[PDB]
Each structure stands twice: as C-alpha cells, then as structure tokens.
Amino acid sequence: DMYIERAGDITWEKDAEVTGNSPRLDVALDESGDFSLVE
C-alpha cells in the first residue's frame, strides 16, 4: 500500500552541479511504453 511524503519545493536553483552529456539517439516506443534503441 503506497503513501507519499513531501521532499521539497519545485525551484530552479542558480549554481547547481552542472553534469550529463546531450546524446542524439534513434529510439522506438512499443505499446507497453518501453523505449528501445533502433540501430
């Protein structure tokens, strides 16, 4: 049985940790809502 707890406000924060790349990927979306790589 699932419950929710508040974890914070939704705010943009100036000077957060800036990380991650920006990959361009060919993907398929099936009827179950699973993405997959089309190569």
């Binding site: 508040r6 406000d9 993907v27 809502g33």
Partner: protein, 156 residues
C-alpha cells in the same frame, strides 16, 4: 491529506522496511507520477486517499484527484534541471543540456543522468521553475548508463 504544491516521494511498506518506488509532482491539487511507479494503484497521504483520475501505459503517466495539469515544454535549446529525489537522500537539483530521442512520431528531449530506479517521477524544470516533464522512462545505452525521455502529458 497534504495538498501543498511541490515534489513528493512515493513509498511502500509491502517490501522490507519503507521502500521508495518513485517520486511525483503535486500541482493545483493533482498528483502527477509515472505509471510504472504506482501501476495505477491508489495512494495514501496521511489519512487522505488519492484515487487515479487519468493514466496511459504508453505515455507511462498517471494523475491523481484530477486531470494532468503540467503543460510546459523543453524549448529545444536551454539547459534544464533534474530535481532528483533519490531513495534516502535529500532533494538535489542537477543542471544539464538535454539530448534528443529521435522517433517515427517525432523528437523528444532526453536527460543522460544515472540514478536509482526509485528516482522515477522526479520533475525536470525550465529556467522559470515550470515542470516540463518527468524523469524515469528511457533506455540503457552503448555504455550501460541510463538516458531518460523528458516525458510530458497533455493538459485539456
């Protein structure tokens, strides 16, 4: 029940201890998460009950108490922030430039940040603090890391 706007943890006691299965966004009295986190089950907030209102396994979204409210979109240029809420760890903003999921039905923003499965439902923000989508549905890549769509619903 607590109906204040903000980000929330989704928890179960059906396993060992209290386990975090995902995250969601309360806005305008509606709770928003990803389908794979709740499987469309009802939710408790204190003594209050949240019943599902709208959902779609293919979009992998679900709303509680009311229709989908989040209509903001990635502009396809500007950096964004993943307001990650990992299991047992404080809310933390992580700023990134999204890549692109190319599909037959069109292009979608993607964020390449690696967090436990229980972080599914964490919101992605634009510069004005508006939710442009939820983190937690995408693909495992050549490397082995995770890339998530920026998944957004339609507002009617």
């Amino acid at each position: 029940g607590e109906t204040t706007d903000g980000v929330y943890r989704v928890m179960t006691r059906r396993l060992l201890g209290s386990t975090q299965v995902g995250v969601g966004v309360m806005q305008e009295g509606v709770f928003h998460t990803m389908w794979h986190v709740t499987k469309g089950a009802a939710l408790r907030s204190g003594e209050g009950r949240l019943d599902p209102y709208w959902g779609d396994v293919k979009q992998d979204l679900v709303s509680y108490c009311g229709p989908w409210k989040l209509d903001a979109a990635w502009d396809g240029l500007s950096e964004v922030q993943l307001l990650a809420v990992p299991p047992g760890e404080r809310a933390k903003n992580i700023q990134t430039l999204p890549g692109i999921f190319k599909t037959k039905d069109g292009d979608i923003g993607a964020v390449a940040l690696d967090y436990p499965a229980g972080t599914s439902g964490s919101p992605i923000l634009d510069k004005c603090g508006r939710v442009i989508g939820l983190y937690g549905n995408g693909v495992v890549i050549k490397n082995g890391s995770y890339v998530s769509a920026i998944t957004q619903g339609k507002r009617e």
